[PDB]
Amino acid sequence: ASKIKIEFTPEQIEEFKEAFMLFDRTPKCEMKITYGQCGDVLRALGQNPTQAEVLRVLGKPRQEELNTKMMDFETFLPMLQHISKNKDTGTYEDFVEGLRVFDKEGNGTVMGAELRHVLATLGERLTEDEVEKLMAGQEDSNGCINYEAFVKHIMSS
């Protein structure tokens, strides 16, 4: 699906492979890795793949294709590097400006429940427990989530 275009230093590939083995749930079939949950590691590898993008980087896999069948990541490694180098992401000030309009008082914060709702429903599909653990701690007494600090913590960590 993707051609070999750019390769980084092999030690970076080596540590990516090490993390994959960490996530490798196949004891004897360690050569093959999860087809669909590799995008979850790509999420964990300092990248932020959107749902549609993390789907068609895999050529529109099916749910059975996503989970049942296996795949060799090293074929996808050039495409993972391509996704990393696309830089199809906004900036921190861009993020805070975008989430600023989602307010009705301009206090520098956003109410928690509507933030969870838009994160789960308005945007890409995400389980709720994920959103409460995302703003776990970021949640305050009156619900006015500090969206600037929250988003800087997110993109930084």
Partner: peptide
């Protein structure tokens, strides 16, 4: 004033966190 309470600076807010003629207050303080 209501604009002041919803300002970006916490300083301006805490000056106008709430809002007694001045002559009577001065006499009482004296």
């Amino acid at each position: 004033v209501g604009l002041y309470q919803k300002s970006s600076l916490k300083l301006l807010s805490t000056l106008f966190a709430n809002y007694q003629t001045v002559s009577a207050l001065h006499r009482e303080n004296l």
